[PDB]
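Notebook, student rotation project (T.W.).
Task set for the rotation: take a protein with a known small-molecule partner, predict the structure of the complex, and write up what can be learned from the model alone. Partner molecule chosen: NDP. Sequence and SMILES entered below by T.W., checked by me.
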Amino acid sequence: QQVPILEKFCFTPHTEEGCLSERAALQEELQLCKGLVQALQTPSQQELPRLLSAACRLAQVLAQERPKLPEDPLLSGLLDSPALKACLDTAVENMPSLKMKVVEVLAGHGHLYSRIPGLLSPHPLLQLSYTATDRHPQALEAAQAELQQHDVAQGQWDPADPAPSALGSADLLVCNCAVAALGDPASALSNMVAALREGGFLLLHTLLRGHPLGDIVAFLTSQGILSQDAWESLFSRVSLRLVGLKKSFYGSTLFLCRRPTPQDSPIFLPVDDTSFRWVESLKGILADEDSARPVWLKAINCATSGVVGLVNCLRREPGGNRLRCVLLSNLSSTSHVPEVDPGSAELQKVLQGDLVMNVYRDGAWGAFRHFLLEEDSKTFCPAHKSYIIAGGLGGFGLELAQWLIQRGVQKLVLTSRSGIRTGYQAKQVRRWRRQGVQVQVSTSNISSLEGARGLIAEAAQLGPVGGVFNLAVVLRDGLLENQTPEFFQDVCKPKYSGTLNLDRVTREACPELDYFVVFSSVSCGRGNAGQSNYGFANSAMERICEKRRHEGLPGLAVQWGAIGDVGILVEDTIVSGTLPQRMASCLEVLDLFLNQPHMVLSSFVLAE
Ligand SMILES: NC(=O)C1=CN([C@@H]2O[C@H](COP(=O)(O)OP(=O)(O)OC[C@H]3O[C@@H](n4cnc5c(N)ncnc54)[C@H](OP(=O)(O)O)[C@@H]3O)[C@@H](O)[C@H]2O)C=CC1
Ligand SMILES: O=C(c1ccc(-c2nc3ccccc3o2)cc1)N1CCN(C(=O)C2(O)CC2)CC1
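Predicted structure of the complex:
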């Protein structure tokens, strides 16, 4: 009995402020801590309140309680929040392989070993080597159980010194210096940079002077607590580029920085051409194995480009290391579209960061990130409305049909270019009809506007159209070297065209539509070698659903991992470290997912 990992997939600005606003417990604790300091000058059992309360009666006291202080909910707020995961997933996404070597500085008071390995462990392919270091062996003695549980190696490193050889060519260095003292920050950071490979990341958690929490801790302990400007000056000083910034409402901060790489001349390739002629171009560019020139796919003219899913798949193929993209994707027609031509300022910023994923949406640069879903109550359907499944005679289609009938659907149109071709398809339609369900098998093809209009018309004869579900798929798997514009056309027709055509027809003629649902893939969400065209097609549908939801229309894309029992995959097999999700699991997840306000959801099952 298997437990899927359920996530939302959300546009995430590189820069976020006001983080942890909604968290009333931190809002309350801060107000209390502000009073207790206001009292010294003139959540209450938590460490920083308890320490401030002990200071009101009266150096010795805090020295005892310093090892307990990092786990104060304000001090640890950003760490136990989606901001940490966003920063980590950004590093992983920018690795040349699925091996990340991580080194924690001053782990003793840092405690990032108790979060980072666990945040990354649910990833099926990622090979993590995490080393918790500190200046004294005594520093990490209390945590020895947690280090073993999380498979964390141990090291001795005072960041005042050069790093031990062992810890060199690190991919990511992490340091929670909320409580731990770097000493001379410029020296510390300088040594931390040298320990990184070129293009390696630094993730620093700290408190900002000029913000309530830093000023409170600053006042209490009287090098130390720096302003944002000082930190950002220090990053430039040691030649780091700030590529991500997460600020809590009380001035706790995650800085995501990157050591620059000597950049060869970039190749720009527009991937907006609806004929996919750019496929042949890209093939010739990546065919040159000699070339280490980075390849920048530009989607600037089409908000529904699937470039992101494309990139995820091509990064898994030979020469994939080289690939980056720019996507302009405003949900609002009122939003400014920035100029990103070679000379421009907006592009130079993107190039300096050199991130794989550069998505511009309604004023901010960011990327789509995955976040653990919250809830993890059975749905029911209006019995008078018609329900359309494109690809309805498929593996997942026949199960989705049954599942809709169990929830009160009496009016189904199942679309298929070739109609009933198996005895199972024949048996199921015949049984449902016997059961008094109106089941139309239609060859009307959503790939064209005509077919889509025909299909809605057919549905509308049964009852007003309540739901459309795009489960249509054509596969043309192969590495890019064996792809053609025609193969891309074939894979995109049922999904991109199909979803565009349904979008437009349901807008024009389905005012009673409750459900617009497309079945995307982990192949798009995470990437799969040999499926770049499928990556793109699924990614486009997701961009359509986001747009629809922004205008208040129904829109949900579901990124399924492998499906068991029925479907393409089936026609016990661990797949890229995942189990095919059993159909009973898929269907109870879909109940959860259908009554959810998020635009793109993900479900996959991890192999143990
Ligand atoms: N199975 C899996 O492991 C996974 C599936 N998914 C997604 O889930 C969905 C269901 O896949 P699954 O049931 O496995 O696949 P199947 O191949 O079993 O069924 C898909 C059906 O789509 C039909 N189809 C293709 N193009 C069109 C079109 N233009 N109009 C109407 N019908 C069309 C095909 O029939 P015909 O040839 O007669 O047109 C086929 O029967 C797909 O969107 C897929 O991408 C995602 C992740 C994993
Ligand atoms: O080979 C995989 C595969 C690839 C990668 C992963 C995976 N990578 C991850 C990274 C991080 C987190 C979770 C992750 O999961 C899981 C499975 N398939 C089969 C095909 N497939 C399809 O859709 C079809 O082509 C049949 C239609 C999708 C699944």
